[PDB]
Amino acid sequence: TLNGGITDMLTELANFEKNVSQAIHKYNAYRKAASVIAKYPHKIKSGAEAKKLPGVGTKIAEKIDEFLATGKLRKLEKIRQDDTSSSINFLTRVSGIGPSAARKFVDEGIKTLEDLRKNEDKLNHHQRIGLKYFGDFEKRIPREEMLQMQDIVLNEVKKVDSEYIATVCGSFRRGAESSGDMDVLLTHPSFTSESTKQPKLLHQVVEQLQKVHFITDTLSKGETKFMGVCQLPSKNDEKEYPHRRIDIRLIPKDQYYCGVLYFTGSDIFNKNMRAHALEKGFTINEYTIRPLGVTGVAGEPLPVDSEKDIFDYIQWKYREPKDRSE
Template sequence: MVPLKRRKVANSGTLNAGTHNSAATQPNKFPQVILFLLERKMGASRRAFLSQLGRRKGFQVEELFSKNVTHVICESNTAQEARMWLEAQGAGQAGRHLLDVSWYTESMRDGHPVEILDRHKLQEFAVNDSEVTPFSVPGYACQRRCTLENHNAVLTDALSLLAENAELSDEDGRGVAFRRAAAVLKALPSAVTNMSQLTGLPCLGGHSLRVIKDILENGTSSEVESTKESERFKALKVLTGIFGVGSKTADRWIREGIHNLQQLRDSGQTLNRAQQAGLEHYDDIKQPVSLAEAEAIRGIVGRAVASVSPEAQIVLTGGFRRGKLTGHDVDFLITHPEEGSEVGLMPKLVSWLESRGLLLYQKTTRNSYLECSEGPGRPPSNIDRFERCLSIFKLSAGQTGSGVQSDETTASPSTTERRWRAVRV
């Protein structure tokens, strides 16, 4: 049996320089006209169809852009967009016609290059600078007034993803730069529609501006899309999503061939208490926490605080205090009107909660401002020196009016069966 011979598929890339040599097409009838069809906004399949049509009519249609191209054919592009594309290829417009696809189709119909009229030329859309009002934002973040409504979510989500990727790769400097740029965009009173609106804004570096420009012009950023599809980024996201796992530990596991939770479970890795709890309650912890759930936990912890120290006060902080309806964890600040009386409060509070089976995991850190017999206390982290507790809280369904999950459609089967969920507190 004779094996089937695969038909060669022509490379449709448009970002490299070169020429296309097709022996199956008609001889070039018009050597003075060398055409290139810009795929941007035209689409790959339509471009391929029109290219084949032109070659059958005897036109020289280049598959890849080269310096020999005399006519650039575009669809739904402005002259500015076409020139920007040419500049990205290291070429200019000099000696080239930037034409609408209508000229191409008319030439195909008549069987020869038709006269170039004004209606065939790409339109120039001059931006009236007087109509574009640049935004004004204070240089210091503490001076900015930000609302919960983000008018530039597409831009800030893209920058936040790049920031997260940088942080997971231990590139803290790049991560901070992207975070600052995203924070500035969140403070803007309306959506960004033109790059000139960003003139003079603080914290917008060259890299961030390139990403913003790419999204405004193309709808997406190639860098952001490639980052999303990166297998390493996906693995880092999954592994660092485990409570108690940082980027360095996740990176080490990836080098050892661990890319998902099941591989971690099967690997026999030695996990500390926090990581064991994080892996066990992974699905719960990844689910958003609703305001109703946060308030329910506040009520429980509030009763515990009143029991061990009646004069102490508890405040729900973090995103919920700023008015958000969902969050990733629940933060509380516990204070006492008499300085010094807060010392030792946290162990008593934790003991009260543990005795009632409300903590699945907890780690309490003492007040390192105090001096002990071994010498001055040292801060164990960069948060602060006060007593604190990082925990995984067990919240029963009956303790919140909205049910266990903030979104039942995303709840895991095990969570809905056991009627309680784990929450980071």
């Protein structure tokens, strides 16, 4: 964090463009510029120094020059102050409330936790849960507690069928001291490309995790994806652990490695990879690795037995999960 002040600035700018301006590409743009600087090995002494890097253009060098000089950004003070921009910004921190919804509420005077509290009957199931665990959801998860969760998940999965291979991923697999949530990749022999579609492969496990009382709430549940709420059990009469977010995705067996790659990220890493795999002549997606023909056609899915295998195809130094945090 040699350039920490700059990348924090870039980040707030991102959220702004994404939550208020509803311009997902400026968001990405700032998001990208930050990751590039947050990986530069020197301490940025000017905006021009930063302008050398790919992802940092004129406006960001200009902003960097102010931040360096002044010590703050005028454009951000304005944002920070403006009530509306400031309010939409807040709402989006509730799970289930994105730009559009937050912008709507604010336009109807609802702009704070208390307001959502008053107008509760004007929120979908997901937004209610969101508000209900507002504080809980913004808390990071100690890597230790993850382990205890990685134990209850992996375990309970076995109890449904010993053939299930539940692999915890995300920044956790990347070996992180804490994680925003718990992402679980799930597979089973009876489910691959072909499959004939096995009904309730995910249902049974979701169900079982609710049996022991580990999964307390459902934000969404389909045939291959579940977004919900879980909670580590408490000793006796201590204090309930914070309620945590859990995502579980059932992927076809012969796509595991490719999916385990995607779901481990980092997200920006994935932006990076699904980008250099094109200059090499391929096209990665969370499900497969495909070659690009003449005009660029989805060639058949190449065989994959390791993450390393995916790197080989695109000729990139194999990087361990821990070094993919970008």
